[PDB]
Design a protein around this ligand. Sequence first.
Ligand SMILES: *[C@@H]1O[C@H](CO)[C@@H](O)[C@H](O)[C@H]1NC(C)=O
Ligand SMILES: *[C@@H]1O[C@H](CO)[C@@H](O)[C@H](O)[C@H]1NC(C)=O
Ligand SMILES: *[C@@H]1O[C@H](CO)[C@@H](O)[C@H](O)[C@H]1NC(C)=O
Length: 146
Amino acid sequence: SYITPYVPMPCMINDTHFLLRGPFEASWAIKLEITDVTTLVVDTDNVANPTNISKCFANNQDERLLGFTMEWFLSGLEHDHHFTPQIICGNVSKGEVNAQVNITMEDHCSQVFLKMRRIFGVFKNPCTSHGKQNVLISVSNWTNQC
Ligand SMILES: *[C@@H]1O[C@H](CO)[C@@H](O)[C@H](O)[C@H]1NC(C)=O
Ligand SMILES: *[C@@H]1O[C@H](CO)[C@@H](O)[C@H](O)[C@H]1NC(C)=O
Ligand SMILES: *[C@@H]1O[C@H](CO)[C@@H](O)[C@H](O)[C@H]1NC(C)=O
């Protein structure tokens, strides 16, 4: 198989906060926050799916590298046709997160949890408890958190 060079540096803050530092020691990092807080609402222009979630990082600088990193992150989930979480892009210029990933479905939550447990290791399972669950994806600055 082919080996991608755009592998981030993972670092887990806590059971609900995770960072993927951009490859080659980038000055940025993808921030992943597991939270039941809904910040975004369906709009005619912001609906996305796993296949074009990269379009939630359009106005960002080094958008190519961001797309490569998100591609690495979603390997094994985007190819799955039974992994259909609602994804809402956000207006980063208005202070909103880059993407909101609806993981309310027990199976979608389970898939995301297992991918992140392969990446970061053991942490609290968010799908045990029911109710709304989201993964907020944003781009933050690297301040040597780890
Ligand atoms: C996890 O880390 C974030 C970021 O530092 C912090 O704001 C939050 O309070 C922490 N959450 C818990 C459950 O301690
Ligand atoms: C992603 O593709 C779907 C159709 O497959 C479309 O509805 C949506 O607008 C696309 N996402 C973006 C951000 O353009
Ligand atoms: C997430 O999905 C659930 C059911 O699939 C739905 O009730 C909820 O409204 C969705 N979130 C948003 C912001 O639409």
